[PDB]
Design a protein around this ligand. Structure first.
Ligand SMILES: [Zn+2]
Lengths: 76, 301
């Protein structure tokens, strides 16, 4: 199935995934499309942060859902 | 000729253990902390009589279960905890009703996360987290900080995200009673959801609680989707967003400010009295709240 990821640059990414994919899986796929290291990625669904170990099905992410991708801040 | 001490792996159950005077503790006890210090290579003296030694080498299956129960750690996390405990010796400064850390080892994200958490009433089911939190509230935060750094993916001396520190903490707290009712409206249709726990008290995508109350639009395949909270039932709410130099929303209790680009620096403002601006351990009264805000705390009552 397809899901969409909206980025901070404005670009919308199209991912091919299965409901059994984990958020870690999704982040790896995002790295492949965009080159962003998974450890820098924060994924959000309608305001809720998505945890690495859970699956799309766990979050009721269905076909053609749109996630939001932001980068973790680095403040020292 | 032997000093009597207490050995534990979890701070819940202890066994009497004896060490010969003059002998290095590690010889008999393995790797050990006592009063937050690694004493593995310290020679046993009577000053340590009756004190508590936390062991973390050669953990049995039963010890690992006790550590999971009291810390929520597996063995690598426990070792990371004691490494962090040994390294994070940052001075703490009291500023009226609050404390803050001197600038050190890129700890600004911890400083402002801790300044925001000092407003919260939290309880922790796991014994070590509750005890470290009590010390935190008393102005001795380093044990609590070390738990968080070990529980998360944080690397010592690396700049990081204050929201990740707060989220690691809130996932350990008992937020059983916290819920919010959300409604979503777009051309796709209308759906409801009740968020619970950490998902009820943290929201990402706006700083303004009023956006949730009124509804605000996010991207959707149909164009845009309205997100609307129809009922709040939370003791507090943290609204977070990409850093933005907007006006501080109404009713905010405290806010985190992120200044810079790829790598930046956190500051923190409190709104009673309006305003107190914290930067490391400095606090100054200012007449306006400005900067690129990234987290805003709302409190009930
Ligand atoms: Zn829609």
């Amino acid at each position: 199935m397809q899901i969409f990821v909206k980025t901070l640059t404005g670009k919308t990414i199209t991912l091919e995934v299965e409901p059994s994919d984990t958020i870690e899986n999704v982040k790896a796929k995002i790295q492949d499309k965009e080159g962003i290291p998974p450890d820098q990625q924060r994924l959000i669904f309608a305001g809720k942060q998505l945890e690495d170990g859970r699956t799309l099905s766990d979050y009721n992410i269905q076909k053609e859902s749109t996630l939001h991708l932001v980068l973790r801040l680095r403040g020292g | 000729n032997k000093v009597d001490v207490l050995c534990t792996v979890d701070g819940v159950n202890f066994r009497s253990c004896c060490v010969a005077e003059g002998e290095v503790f590690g010889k008999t006890l393995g790797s050990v902390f006592c009063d937050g210090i690694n004493v593995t290579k310290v020679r046993c003296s009577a000053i340590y009589k009756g004190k508590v030694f936390f062991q973390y080498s050669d953990l049995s299956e039963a010890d690992l279960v006790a550590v999971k129960d009291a810390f929520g750690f597996d063995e690598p996390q426990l070792l990371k905890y004691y490494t962090m405990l040994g390294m994070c010796k940052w001075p703490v400064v009291v500023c009226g009703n609050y404390f803050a850390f001197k600038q050190s080892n890129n700890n600004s994200y911890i400083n402002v996360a801790c300044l925001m958490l000092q407003h919260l009433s939290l309880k922790f089911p796991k014994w070590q987290w509750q005890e470290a939190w009590n010390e935190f509230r008393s102005g001795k935060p380093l044990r609590f900080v070390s738990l968080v750094l070990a529980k998360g993916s944080f690397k010592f001396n690396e700049p990081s995200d204050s929201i990740d520190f707060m989220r690691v903490v809130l996932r350990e707290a008992d937020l059983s009673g916290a819920t919010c009712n959300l409604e979503f409206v777009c051309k796709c249709g209308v759906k409801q959801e009740q968020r619970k726990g950490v998902d009820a008290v943290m929201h990402f995508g706006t700083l303004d609680k009023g956006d949730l109350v009124r509804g605000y639009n996010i991207a959707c395949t149909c164009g845009s989707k309205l997100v609307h909270c129809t009922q709040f039932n939370v003791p507090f709410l943290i609204c977070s967003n990409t850093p933005e130099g907007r006006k501080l929303p109404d009713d905010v209790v405290a806010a985190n400010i992120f200044t810079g680009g790829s790598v930046g620096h956190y500051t923190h403002v409190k709104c009673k009295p309006k305003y107190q601006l914290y930067d490391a351990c400095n606090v100054n009264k200012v007449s306006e709240a400005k900067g690129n805000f990234t987290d805003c705390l709302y409190l009930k009552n």
